[PDB]
Amino acid sequence: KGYPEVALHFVKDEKTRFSLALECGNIEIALEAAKALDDKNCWEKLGEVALLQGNHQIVEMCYQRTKNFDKLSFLYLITGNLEKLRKMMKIAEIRKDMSGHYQNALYLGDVSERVRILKNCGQKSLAYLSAATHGLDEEAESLKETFDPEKETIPDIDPNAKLLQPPAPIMPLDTNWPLLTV
Amino acid sequence: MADKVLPTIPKEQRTRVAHFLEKQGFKQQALTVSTDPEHRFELALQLGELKIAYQLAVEAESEQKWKQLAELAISKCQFSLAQECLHHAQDYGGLLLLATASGNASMVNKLAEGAERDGKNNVAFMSYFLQGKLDACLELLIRTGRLPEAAFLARTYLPSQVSRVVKLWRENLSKVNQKAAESLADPTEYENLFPGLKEAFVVEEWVKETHADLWPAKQYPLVTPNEERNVMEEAKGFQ
């Protein structure tokens, strides 16, 4: 291409338009095109690409239907703010899990996952390991005893790695990212 | 009576009968006769002489043994050792689950080393983070070509690599010319970086922080120290 001014003289179907949407990279036409795409993969590349070209404010949406949920979550934790991830956490915790809860815990201190977690484990082991620091090792023991306990040896693991970093005043976050064509 | 006979049975015999014994459910006894590394092994799974099983393993000579065994060990909650085997296995995933649950840096360094090993980008990041190490996360990105994303981190939690990194990303973009594609500015214009003056760097909070990293946040806890990371955190952090 030479301009998408060209696109303007002629161009057609959403499918065709779409082709243009890549060919030009006409992402204007893409936007609609996208709306009208629904050939996933198509999208699937594209939001990123969209991001790549710009705007994550939008990209987030794109991805939202796309089920790169975790990725969005990742964006949220990247940024230095706390809720959105948590609802999402709810809404995927609520959609089962055996290895994923982890995502909610680190950037946090406190997790509620533990209430659920114990049920998956329920050997008071996880519950203790997890438990002890909120000053709450104790409930984990109560059950553990009730069972007829089975713990007897442990390996290193004493909380020793830093869940730290993110964004104190001066020099941002990025909810929204500015740029310029220049 | 049989015992007199017992001298007068060897290798293979012991095995068959061992299976019988096993049928008898005289597992221990079955253990005593035990006669094949496999045979000993499976029985050992059933049996659980844990240390003992290790000796049979000796050098196991198959992670599969360790994998199988790991599940077993873990069941027995013979973790110190389990960690040693699993570590010996260096079978990262399960091992991670324990290690993480109590938590641990040391595990993390060795693991970091591991993290480097694994071959998909993503895990290694969590680690880098987990350790608290922007630096690590960012270095990692350099290899993978995570570039847009790397910029976000570099921005958010400022190592001001956003400036450094952005130039390079932009360069790629640059390669793929078009001015919009090029995209440009750091202190001023398009971006106003340090002139914007907003939320990922500075000294005072940071000093407080410097310490902070060192103590345990506290609320009420165990020998397994504190750090929190919630509402409170937000407030001080702003300060």
UniProtKB/Swiss-Prot annotation, chain A:
Organism superkingdom: Eukaryota
Location in the cell: Cytoplasm; Golgi apparatus membrane; Cytoplasmic vesicle, COPI-coated vesicle membrane
Summary of subunit composition and partner proteins: Oligomeric complex that consists of at least the alpha, beta, beta', gamma, delta, epsilon and zeta subunits. Interacts with SCYL1. Interacts with JAGN1. Interacts with TMEM41B. Interacts with SVEP1. Probably interacts with PEX11A.
Function summary: The coatomer is a cytosolic protein complex that binds to dilysine motifs and reversibly associates with Golgi non-clathrin-coated vesicles, which further mediate biosynthetic protein transport from the ER, via the Golgi up to the trans Golgi network. Coatomer complex is required for budding from Golgi membranes, and is essential for the retrograde Golgi-to-ER transport of dilysine-tagged proteins.
Protein name: Coatomer subunit alpha
Gene that specifies this protein: Copa
Curated annotation (Swiss-Prot), chain B:
Domain of life (superkingdom): Eukaryota
Modified residues (N6-acetyllysine): K23
Subcellular location: Cytoplasm, Cytosol; Golgi apparatus membrane; Cytoplasmic vesicle, COPI-coated vesicle membrane
WD repeats (start-end): 142-179
Disrupted-gene phenotype: The knockout of the gene results in early embryonic lethality with no viable embryos recovered at 12.5 dpc.
Subunit record text: Oligomeric complex that consists of at least the alpha, beta, beta', gamma, delta, epsilon and zeta subunits. Probably interacts with PEX11A. Interacts with SCYL1. Interacts with JAGN1.
Protein family: Belongs to the WD repeat COPB2 family.
Functional description taken from the UniProt entry: The coatomer is a cytosolic protein complex that binds to dilysine motifs and reversibly associates with Golgi non-clathrin-coated vesicles, which further mediate biosynthetic protein transport from the ER, via the Golgi up to the trans Golgi network. Coatomer complex is required for budding from Golgi membranes, and is essential for the retrograde Golgi-to-ER transport of dilysine-tagged proteins. This coatomer complex protein, essential for Golgi budding and vesicular trafficking, is a selective binding protein (RACK) for protein kinase C, epsilon type. It binds to Golgi membranes in a GTP-dependent manner.
Name recorded for this polypeptide: Coatomer subunit beta'
Native organism: Mus musculus
Shown residues in whole-protein numbering: 605 to 843 of 905
